[PDB]
Amino acid sequence: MNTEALQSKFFSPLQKAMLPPNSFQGKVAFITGGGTGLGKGMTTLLSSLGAQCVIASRKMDVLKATAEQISSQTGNKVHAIQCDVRDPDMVQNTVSELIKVAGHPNIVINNAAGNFISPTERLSPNAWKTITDIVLNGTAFVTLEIGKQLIKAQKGAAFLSITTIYAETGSGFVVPSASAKAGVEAMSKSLAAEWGKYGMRFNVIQPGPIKTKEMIGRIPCGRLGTVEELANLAAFLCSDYASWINGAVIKFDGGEEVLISGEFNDLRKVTKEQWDTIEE
Template identity: 80%
Template sequence: MRKVERRHWHMFFSHGRKTLYQNVEAPQAKFFRPLLKAMLPPDTFKGKVAFITGGGTGLGKAMTTFLSTLGAQCVIASRNTDVLKATAEQISSQTGNEVHAIQCDVRNPEMVHNSVMELIRVAGHPDIVINNAAGNFISPTERLSCNAWKTISDIVLNGTAYVTLEIGKQLIKAQKGAAFLAITTIYAETGSGFVVPSSSSKAGVEAMSKSLAAEWGKYGMRFNVIQPGPIKTKGAFSRLDPTGAFEKDMIDRIPCGRLGTVEELANLAVFLCSDYASWISGAVIRFDGGEEAFISGEFNSLSKVTKEEWDTIEGLIRKTKGS
């Protein structure tokens, strides 16, 4: 059983900094071209503080970059200090806005408490909190040990809870509101084999977010969730899919005909965390190019039937008598 330190299931097949160059998009992808620049006005987050867990790489880095570009003072946290500091320096030099790096293992409540105290000390109480840190690996469930289960649930569910409760209590004490966002996955809603600890924990995160949207609105806090589907990241699938065959199979079940991009995810995230979304709370937004809708429909595989085959099928149906 090989652990993979990545955010979501779409990150399982990453390797180093290699990039796939082949284009396996479906023809309809031309109708769904991604816009990669920040959609909100400059200075949307000027004077705001954002705290992002798992902010050093991948989706967390993209969301931090967009928030910083739009004026936020960002504080990123993760276990890997070297990666975290390099990301903070890179984004800060790119946007001109300060990015702080705080080492934090979200599995450790005491470390979370200390990190939140440092966050408040260096930047102030956060206006935006993004729970993005996660861990996962694929495995037949019968091969899982209790420790394997605990490792994932401690990061995904307990870690999100520790961060949310610690920051929430500090905000209540300071009588200050904030927008919380959790990054889950499409299988949090449906369940999925081979990632059972992750799907169970992510489902818990979604239940917690909706519950707190109901309970803590009175304190000025909003809670929303994004469920990403497969997102194209640097080096995606390059170890297990050097020819692009796996990626093509995946795209075959995405109606929009392509993988998502980190910039698109970041745009959705910063919108949900902005004052433009001040009436959105308790929402769970699927972000997957239509994949879940496609794989959920019992007859959607009929999209592979050709025109000639449909002519034959229609003829047979017309000949059918009775009910």
């Protein structure tokens, strides 16, 4: 069969829960940006596997609707907490409330982000600072405060940051996002080293484009990723099956980064007949 058909047959999405039913029972999970997109998918999966989930972002309206929607789907409680992660006080309140309504988290997912697609010369200083504040400082603030509380309580936890494939390579047009996300990965590798002694491990997923265009022509797997596939990976990394995975950075991108970064991968449209000619 042709490319598209091989890709569809051999890279078909498996969009159901992977981990055993109720495997996350008795675990508390905290997800920033848990009300939409990737955060929402991860919450849905964790809740449905029995985790007690707490989600936090700026828009209380969307947050409550999502918490209520997942709650009635899974039977398990999702708590919503309004929080701007770039404000240390709201963060401190948020963690205080987190611990009151659920208890110390076993799973912390740093997923809240902001992004502008723009030529960099059209960005104001404030536009840049906004992305940096939400992504990097926001993740630092949440990690610092939860980290401090866990040390005091002598409990550990699994941390996961969702970054991006361009965090490692950089990219034009998404520059403050690229910088801030790169900062997030270094933080994770840093705290994986520093905080092992406290029972805290830190890992990263770098996603490519998830269905939530013909960037597909740049994806060896021949489709966009799905939220449910990403969530399975996240759940695995935040589970006890992955208790020895620490400091890891995992690409979830259908092969996109290796494709675009490989110098001669622009020969991929060259036909059989054209190859016969080149070899002569």
